[PDB]
Amino acid sequence: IVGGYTCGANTVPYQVSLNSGYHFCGGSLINSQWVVSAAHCYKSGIQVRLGEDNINVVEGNEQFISASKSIVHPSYNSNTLNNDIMLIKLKSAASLNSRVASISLPTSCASAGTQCLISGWGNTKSSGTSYPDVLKCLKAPILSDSSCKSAYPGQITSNMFCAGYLEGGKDSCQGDSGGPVVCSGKLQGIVSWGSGCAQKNKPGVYTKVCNYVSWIKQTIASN
Ligand SMILES: Cc1nc2ccccc2n1Cc1ccc2c(c1)nc(CNc1ccc(C(=N)N)cc1)n2C
Numbered sequence: 001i002v003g004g005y006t007c008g009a010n011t012v013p014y015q016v017s018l019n020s021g022y023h024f025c026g027g028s029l030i031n032s033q034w035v036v037s038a039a040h041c042y043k044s045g046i047q048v049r050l051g052e053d054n055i056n057v058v059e060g061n062e063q064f065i066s067a068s069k070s071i072v073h074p075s076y077n078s079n080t081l082n083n084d085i086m087l088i089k090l091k092s093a094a095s096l097n098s099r100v101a102s103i104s105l106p107t108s109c110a111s112a113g114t115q116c117l118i119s120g121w122g123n124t125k126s127s128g129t130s131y132p133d134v135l136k137c138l139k140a141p142i143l144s145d146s147s148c149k150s151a152y153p154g155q156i157t158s159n160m161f162c163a164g165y166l167e168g169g170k171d172s173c174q175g176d177s178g179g180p181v182v183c184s185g186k187l188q189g190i191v192s193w194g195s196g197c198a199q200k201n202k203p204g205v206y207t208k209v210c211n212y213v214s215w216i217k218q219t220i221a222s223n
């Protein structure tokens with residue numbers, strides 16, 4: 001997260017860290033046994049780390065659970081990043097409490113202007129690399145479709161939306177990928193891609209979760 005602020009320990013209870021000997025992507029807990037993340041975060045040997053703040057120290061409240069299966073959307077296209085969504089089933093159910101909780105799926109899509117909270121342990125610098133120990137947060141509004149398509153001509157599909165600041169300086173970044181974009185208590189987006197991080201006129205692009213509610217429900221019900 002570039003230009004954000006320290007969230008505060010366990011203030012984003014649905015935030016997950018995908019770990020394979022190091023943090024590589026974020027995710028969101030949607031029920032006791034399922035996490036939603038980005039398809040491009042797919043890899044084998046995934047350990048889901050819940051209740052985290054400092055990802056380098058065991059401070060208490062952490063739950064490390066191996067993924068039993070990762071379901072990448074069948075129509076995910078790695079070249080266009082269309083359908084960049086993945087479901088991860090936990091080997092065992094997470095113990096839900098004050099510091100580990102699930103986020104609700106949306107019943108409708110969010111409109112332009114809606115303010116959302118984006119979080120993660122990704123890169124904090126526009127130029128260069130600096131990964132934080134603790135969870136960073138950022139409040140950003142959903143941009144209009146016209147502004148989004150003007151920023152990324154021919155690259156925005158109906159399954160994507162832009163959120164952020166055209167002036168640059170505040171954005172999600174590499175490492176935040178797969179993480180949550182929560183608006184009015186509903187998971188509306190998944191950190192997906194962008195051109196650089198926090199660059200002028202290059203806002204972040206996110207997977208439009210409202211287009212996948214039926215798919216998520218049908219897939220979870222059959223696995
Ligand atoms: C290289 C390319 N071929 C494309 C074809 C169609 C559309 C975009 C395309 N891109 C750009 C692109 C595509 C995927 C990318 C990317 C940059 N950079 C990342 C790394 N993660 C990432 C996450 C968030 C942000 C951000 N909010 N600014 C920036 C980058 N991924 C996971």
Ligand SMILES: [Ca+2]
Nearest residue numbers: 054055057058
């Ligand atoms: Ca920790």
